[PDB]
Scaffold this active site. Structure first.
Site: not given
Ligand SMILES: O=C(c1cncc2ccccc12)N1CCN(c2cccc(Cl)c2)C(=O)C1
Ligand SMILES: O=C(c1cncc2ccccc12)N1CCN(c2cccc(Cl)c2)C(=O)C1
Ligand SMILES: [Cl-]
Lengths: 301, 305
Positions: B41, B143, B145
């Site tokens: 993503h 932030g 991920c």
């Protein structure tokens, strides 16, 4: 979202852990630059522990009586000195993995990460707090002496604890990295006991603010309290007195949630009176006291 | 003495964390050998996330659209490919800090350490369990991920989780390192919810053994029970079924404490039907289910890495 008991990443400290042996005793040492720090009791025999004269025991040792192992490499000891309850072994190699560091002595209520080690090898990392009675509720077994506590706010490691002993109640006592014990403890096998412990009030309030930031409001109430009435109630539940310094420290969390400190103090008084009534706060059925106001801000923001 | 929620030492994983940027999105990547793994993503804009065609979004990207930063050094991306929900960025430099590693997919009930990262920099380490509903009760902000979960089995890092999203209840969802989600989740901005969770029974029993090893015996009783009777109680209280495999796994702790697994089940049944009556176990007023039998033995024996 979420709120966990979170430790600092331990990598910077792992690269400093070494094994220190003196005679039959093996424990952990902290290798920073060309010095290895470890508990001075590494020089004691079984018959020395009740009333050791460390100056007399140390004067009898030479550099080659200290075996320091960093990984599978033997470091050469070229000097030895004692500072309070810590032994400092000068070595012929500066640790190439030495992080930016400082030695800081902490106050009760402060939290830190502990890197538990055995034979110079790290086994786990967990979060601790310096209890009001100057002990720490760690998880330590035989061979863990010399394991350290630290914080890593930014990239500087602040070493605040070195493990020395386990008291009869299963709690732990140690020193700062200058060898000064936290609390009224001594590095002797003499009868020593932790004083009655109390709950770290400012930390419980910080954690209630964390719960509000995370969306939990069930424990809030329409009341406020004076600081003195709060303290009279809280001391009856074995809570530490809340000072004006603690109220000031909670200011940013108060401003962020819109709940005045004395207003949160009234919630705490009600929680002490009523319990949780089957409810939880941040996944806990007890009031958590091992998160400081600084921990809450770092984790929630 | 003492029993703490303990994570593995994170150093071996810290040396693998990098920052991955694609356009306006910045997240964390795991750099192992010459490949950087991160959530696919990272290539999506806010509109793309509503109904993403990852193959179509990825075909539009060149290697220079991915900025990988390892410390203050920019790595050169020389290839990019997708495996399930993970993006693999081939880089021109093998990570000199690559530990001995493996990718393992874990089962619900299994625990692991999470190294929470922001901008490729580790900020914290915590221990958590893969819930029976395939979520993790993590602690993550914007932030985070690409932050990873792992265990250490001997000297080998077994990577088992990569962070992808936060569900509306504040719990987290991610994938294994082959990009397969844990749970019925998808990497798209669409209505998704964690299912009803259950308690990890074998882990609660392991933690009761840890309490006994640490000197807490108040909850012990003279009774035993059958596995079928106990499983009827477990079902009633939203506890996962206890299997003969779980009983066998608890064998060493049973032998060490002298409390047979079904004897400890009778203690657990009583705790479920009566509560703790104002008492605590290992400093908790709830039954803890995020320590496995292996975690208990490891912590109570001081195994190093
Ligand atoms: O290695 C440990 C140790 C450490 N931590 C937790 C333990 C739990 C079970 C058994 C041993 C330990 N010791 C040796 C030194 N030692 C000590 C005894 C008296 C004085 C001094 Cl300064 C030190 C200890 O207390 C105990
Ligand atoms: O960076 C995060 C994030 C991560 N963890 C905890 C957070 C808590 C507060 C705010 C943001 C986060 N995001 C962006 C991607 N993102 C997402 C949205 C839809 C699908 C997918 Cl696969 C992923 C998120 O869920 C949220
Ligand atoms: Cl219960």
């Amino acid at each position: 979202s979420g709120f966990r008991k979170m430790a600092f990443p331990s990598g910077k400290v792992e690269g400093c852990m070494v094994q220190v042996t003196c005679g039959t005793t093996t424990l952990n040492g902290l290798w920073l630059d060309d010095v290895v720090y470890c508990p001075r009791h590494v020089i004691c025999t079984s018959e020395d522990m009740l009333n050791p004269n460390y100056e007399d025991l140390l004067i009898r040792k030479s550099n080659h009586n200290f075996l320091v192992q960093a990984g599978n490499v033997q470091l050469r000891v070229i000097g030895h000195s004692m500072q309070n309850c810590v032994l400092k072994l000068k070595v012929d190699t500066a640790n190439p993995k030495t992080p930016k560091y400082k030695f800081v002595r902490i106050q009760p209520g402060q939290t830190f990460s502990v890197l538990a080690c055995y034979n110079g090898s790290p086994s786990g990392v967990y979060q601790c707090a310096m209890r009001p009675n100057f002990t720490i509720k760690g998880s330590f077994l035989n061979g863990s002496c010399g394991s350290v506590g630290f914080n890593i706010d930014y990239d500087c490691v602040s070493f605040c604890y070195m493990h020395h002993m386990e008291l009869p109640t299963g709690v732990h006592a140690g020193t700062d990295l200058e060898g000064n014990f936290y609390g009224p403890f001594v590095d002797r096998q003499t009868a020593q006991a932790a004083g009655t412990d109390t709950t770290i009030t400012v930390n419980v309030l910080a954690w209630l603010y964390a719960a509000v930031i995370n969306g939990d409001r069930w424990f809030l109430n329409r009341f406020t309290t004076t600081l003195n009435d709060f303290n009279l109630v809280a001391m009856k539940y074995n809570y530490e007195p809340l000072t004006q310094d603690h109220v000031d420290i909670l200011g940013p969390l108060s401003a962020q949630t819109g709940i005045a400190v004395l207003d949160m103090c009234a919630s705490l008084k009600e929680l002490l009176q009523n319990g949780m009534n089957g409810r939880t706060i941040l996944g806990s059925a007890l009031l958590e006291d091992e998160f400081t106001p600084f921990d809450v801000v770092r984790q929630c923001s």
